Amino acid sequence: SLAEWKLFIYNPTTGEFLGRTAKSWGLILLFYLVFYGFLAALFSFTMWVMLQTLNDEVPKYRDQIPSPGLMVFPKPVTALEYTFSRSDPTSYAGYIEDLKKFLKPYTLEEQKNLTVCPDGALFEQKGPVYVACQFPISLLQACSGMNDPDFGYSQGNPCILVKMNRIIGLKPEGVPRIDCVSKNEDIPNVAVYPHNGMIDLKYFPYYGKKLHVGYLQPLVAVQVSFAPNNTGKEVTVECKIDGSANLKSQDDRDKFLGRVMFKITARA
Amino acid sequence: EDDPFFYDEHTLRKRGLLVAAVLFITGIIILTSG
Amino acid sequence: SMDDHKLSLDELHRKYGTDLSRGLTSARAAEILARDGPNALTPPPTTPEWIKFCRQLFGGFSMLLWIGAILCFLAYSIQAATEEEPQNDNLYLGVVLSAVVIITGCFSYYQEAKSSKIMESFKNMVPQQALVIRNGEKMSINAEEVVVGDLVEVKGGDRIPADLRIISANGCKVDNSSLTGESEPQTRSPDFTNENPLETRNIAFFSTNCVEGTARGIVVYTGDRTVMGRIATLASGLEGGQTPIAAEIEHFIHIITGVAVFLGVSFFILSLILEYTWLEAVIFLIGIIVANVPEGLLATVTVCLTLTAKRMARKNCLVKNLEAVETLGSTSTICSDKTGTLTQNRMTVAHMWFDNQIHEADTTENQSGVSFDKTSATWLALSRIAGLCNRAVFQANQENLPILKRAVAGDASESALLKCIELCCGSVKEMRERYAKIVEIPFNSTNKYQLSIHKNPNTSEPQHLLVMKGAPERILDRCSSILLHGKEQPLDEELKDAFQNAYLELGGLGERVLGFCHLFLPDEQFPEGFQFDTDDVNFPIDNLCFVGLISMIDPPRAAVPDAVGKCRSAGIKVIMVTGDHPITAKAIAKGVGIISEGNETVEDIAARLNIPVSQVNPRDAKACVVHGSDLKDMTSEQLDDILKYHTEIVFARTSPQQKLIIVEGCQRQGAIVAVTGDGVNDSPALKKADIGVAMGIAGSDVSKQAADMILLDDNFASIVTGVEEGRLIFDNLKKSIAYTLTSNIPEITPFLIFIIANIPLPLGTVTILCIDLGTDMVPAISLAYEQAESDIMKRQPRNPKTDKLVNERLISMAYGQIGMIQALGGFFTYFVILAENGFLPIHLLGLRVDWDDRWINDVEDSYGQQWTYEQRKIVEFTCHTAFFVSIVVVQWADLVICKTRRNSVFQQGMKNKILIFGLFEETALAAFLSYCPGMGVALRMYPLKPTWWFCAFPYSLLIFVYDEVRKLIIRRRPGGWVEKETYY
């Protein structure tokens, strides 16, 4: 029941604040300020020296990212599950907003300054100009904004974009493509629109964000059709790469290395 | 011919385990010296 | 108090209702036994061993780790109930934290006092059978059935069953060493002798043994009511309390627990404010708790204590309680017993006076000293008389022993003379064979001398000689000549004055003096065949030839004076507490160095100034001898004055409770008190003392059961060795604690930077556990094998109030300078790993939300590449492994700089082979954890590129150079600002 800490702080004798006087506090704080300033200066110098040894165009190591992953767009709110209603425009508004923002560079208006490249041939560019092939949005028919502002939504046929992760200097072998099949036995119709997946080789290799300015990665658009009266919800569709032995898709630890699985739910 | 996306992880493991064994044996030798 | 010796013979019988000779009726005795209870002591209840473990499992760090394990289990349950696909990482982390708590509890259980068996040792002194007069018949009964107020007969080696009011005795003598610590027999008579029942002659005490004679007594106390029963109850109920090392441990535990709780609560509220989910906040809290708690510190402290206890066990110094290895080093006052502790507990010839000169003999037990001159005819005569007038003889079947270490059946002075004669000249058995006894006269109370008649040495039949021994001041009254250098010289007044001066000189040394004289038969007037057996013969014994004086004392042990001097030089105040008489106590105190030359008591000052002791100021005396009677009625404040104003203090004639009072008074002045003793009367003091030390050979069972440390070889220099080891282990514990604490900052800072700057996590909880329970164990333990930087026996004892084991200067260094440099090195390594893989440091800011999202598998780096969750997670786990390796690399230089506190590594050197092995083992373990296949799934350790090992090299060198320069700045300008701030 004794307040010994009352005299510990603001001690009337000698003016000891927590056992140290005003001068002692000032000296110790000045020492710690100078010490931490010197430490920060040394840390910053060492960081600058390290960054001066790095390449601004290609990362030093690429052995931790040897094969591309497979990802869907847009990213749903939770757990990569697409949930919306046909009748309520505000249920799927975010998906359409994201798709319009993503597909703006792919419209012919923006990519009119790009170059046309022959199909089916790997496009290696040793030169310093590093031109970028153009990906016309017409390949994603019925899943582009040109034909209909609602990307299949408001009709019961949502459109979802599937893209392969960009890797610098990766040259796929064979004929890369992405196939998507419904996991359920009900097998609602899924339509990969550029024929098959058909990841054409002229978009590879990726040369980096710095060098290969204006790059547009190939896109695959999947459309999941539903009946008018029958919702056909809780449909699960899995996509994977099955054209290149260079691009692995059977990894057990990584469920997204070369493949992607997502669920679509439709209402009304 | 160098290839990106590949690193000799197995040789790295051999050399690291060899260095660890050499260090442990040196520590044992220094500890029990006489 | 509560004395029955005042009662007369008739009054005593009517008070207890016992007949004079018939004893007590059997039915009445049974009734008293039913009403009073058995004649036995009641041991106190004992705590079960599983209760002690449960208490140890609730420490300050143990509570934090229990909370961490509970949070791990809660996180696993939440994860399961949310996503239905749990990862068994938090479950395993909680199990591992629980195992760490259990193992730390086991370590703390080992590093704990193991109780005492004092009551068992006391019960071992209760006799199995007691002779009690009941219904007028001698009947042997169990001593537990003895009741209050019945006749008890004890004779010749029978232990006293209860407290007896002796009403008749036939030459009864008892050994009261259980009450006073002195083995000298005391005569028991029915008559009232002393007001104090402790010194009265008509009271026989339980736990003593009647060495000779018979006695009849009335039981006045039984069981716990007896004098020694109360002492046993007091000793068992006492505890030593909290050791200094335990207080220091709990202090730094409080400090670290407060820091951990503050950081944890502050950053948990911060995480909640930043809209973290419950799982993420719980994971962050678990990481902070694990990073803040030193998981291996307490076990390291226990291992260091065990190592220094096993170091002293090689010097015949058994440590019973592991915490006692530091108490001796922290000790500022030693309260030492005299008999058997400072002395050898054996009567020994010390000084002799022949040829008008004092001769000093070698009183050491090993006989390593120099002796007197044996080339004198009068010395030969003196040795003959001394060793031939004895009745005591050596016991059989002990010839394969040192002479001084053989039991002798006889008086203490007789045995001293016998052993002295054996050491000096020949054998007493052969000398008695040469001179055959024909008649003897034993010692008598009114006689004061012993004389014997035997054959002459000169082979002449008519000649004979009569050897005599007795009191010195009465022997010369029967002498008329003194033998000088083998020549018979008549008595001189100047020679009588010299004899008196020598008698005072030897008597003033606390030594008892005996005279010796022999008379040769003058002529044929007494023929050889004359029968001397005729009692009361008309042959007065007079005009004898005096030879010399021999003085006997209980001598100090060989190492005691030097050890006392060294302890006093180390700033330790040595107090003498003994149950012997003041004169012998003061003599031994002067001999062993308790009272140094030039210091005088108030009585000595008054005697020198020829004034009564009342008119002399007590402040002029720096030494004092306090008697038990004066101490009995002395208040607490008066006792405090004695312990404060006197540097040389001697307490004499103290009861076992008064030793406890003295120890409590010394402890009241804020002192760590060591008590060294060997008797059952020291047991309460040994229990109450901060550390109790007992002698091995000399100590009784109770004393070594009540002690914390036992000197197995009875070497008193082991006390000096123990204080030096205690100071050294205190310093080395500071070094080890600093080394263990400074690596907390590299584990704490990554979590704070994670929550503040939203960068991917630089360090995982598993890696933090791998640092503490792993690579930091052997290096921290290796600080225990560190030698003293300077002479630690020159510094004064540390102030427990002020000199703390862990203070703000240790925290300053460890948590503000070295830890921060280590954290910067680890963060530099982390940024190097992430930048070499595509994520530049500017890109990492704010990336934590997307990095940790399991469903975002296109996270983009600074070069435009897109990463899945697993790929960037492998990169992050490689960063964790590299951060671990960087902590090890900076801990290299941390170990090197923690090796010393003031000296440079260049002056001190690198002769600590345990520390070099610690560095090598730490590095080898780090490399094995990084590169062993299968560690990526077990602990999420991944192999590092060879260049990534050298990222923390600049910061390790910076640590080394910084602390070397700081130690240099400390050595110069000793009172400077740097030392006041950083010298812990």
Ligand SMILES: CCCCCCCC/C=C/CCCCCCCC(=O)OC[C@H](COP(=O)(O)OCC[N+](C)(C)C)OC(=O)CCCCCCC/C=C/CCCCCCCC
């Ligand atoms: C990754 C992040 C890691 C973060 C780590 C943070 C570590 C925080 C730990 C703090 C604990 C510090 C104390 C540790 C030791 C406590 C026990 C102890 O052994 O402690 C002794 C003193 C009692 O001293 P005494 O009375 O015996 O002194 C006598 C005069 N002597 C000082 C010359 C001797 O207890 C004290 O010092 C207690 C002092 C406590 C100070 C804590 C607050 C520090 C904040 C400073 C900022 C400035 C605020 C005030 C500004 C005032 C401006 C004028």
Ligand SMILES: CCCCCCCC/C=C/CCCCCCCC(=O)OC[C@H](COP(=O)(O)OCC[N+](C)(C)C)OC(=O)CCCCCCC/C=C/CCCCCCCC
């Ligand atoms: C050192 C400094 C200390 C500072 C203070 C520290 C305080 C720490 C206290 C933390 C308690 C926090 C409050 C309790 C948890 C939050 C309350 C709650 O609302 O939580 C409901 C849970 C979790 O849901 P959520 O809110 O995360 O979901 C949100 C949806 N999201 C996450 C997917 C976005 O519902 C579930 O899923 C699970 C349903 C229940 C199942 C588990 C039963 C609970 C019992 C746990 C005890 C386990 C002990 C095991 C001991 C074994 C010994 C051998």
Ligand SMILES: CCCCCCCC/C=C\CCCCCCCC(=O)O[C@H](COC(=O)CCCCCCC/C=C/CCCCCCCC)COP(=O)(O)OCC[N+](C)(C)C
């Ligand atoms: C940037 C890279 C990382 C930086 C780490 C920074 C910390 C270590 C740096 C420097 C420490 C140098 C220590 C010099 C000691 C000799 C002083 C002296 O001269 O003592 C000499 C004796 O020594 C010795 O026989 C033992 C020498 C042992 C050398 C050990 C070498 C290995 C140590 C490695 C530690 C470095 C970290 C490696 C970690 C493990 C990796 C596998 C001279 O004494 P004396 O016999 O004449 O006197 C005796 C009489 N008396 C004292 C009374 C005057």
Ligand SMILES: CC(C)CCC[C@@H](C)[C@H]1CC[C@H]2[C@@H]3CC=C4C[C@@H](O)CC[C@]4(C)[C@H]3CC[C@]12C
């Ligand atoms: C003491 C102060 C001045 C530091 C001086 C030494 C500095 C310049 C040296 C020592 C250790 C070196 C680092 C060691 C490891 C790597 C990883 C690799 O990518 C090469 C560069 C880098 C990042 C080095 C940069 C330069 C470096 C930091």
Ligand SMILES: CC(C)CCC[C@@H](C)[C@H]1CC[C@H]2[C@@H]3CC=C4C[C@@H](O)CC[C@]4(C)[C@H]3CC[C@]12C
């Ligand atoms: C990452 C960096 C910036 C963290 C900074 C931590 C600083 C503010 C903390 C950590 C350790 C703390 C020090 C710990 C010990 C002492 C000794 C005390 O008598 C005065 C306060 C003082 C000197 C503290 C000052 C504040 C301190 C230096």
Ligand SMILES: CC(C)CCC[C@@H](C)[C@H]1CC[C@H]2[C@@H]3CC=C4C[C@@H](O)CC[C@]4(C)[C@H]3CC[C@]12C
């Ligand atoms: C400079 C002194 C004080 C200490 C030096 C420690 C050095 C010699 C030791 C400690 C750890 C060791 C490294 C451990 C692991 C590897 C990975 C292996 O694939 C190449 C060797 C390499 C890189 C070792 C090189 C030597 C090494 C760096």
Ligand code: ALF
């Ligand atoms: F042995 Al003691 F008083 F000297 F009990």
Ligand SMILES: [K+]
């Ligand atoms: K820790």
Ligand SMILES: [K+]
């Ligand atoms: K004790």
Ligand SMILES: [K+]
């Ligand atoms: K630690």
Ligand SMILES: [Mg+2]
């Ligand atoms: Mg004794």
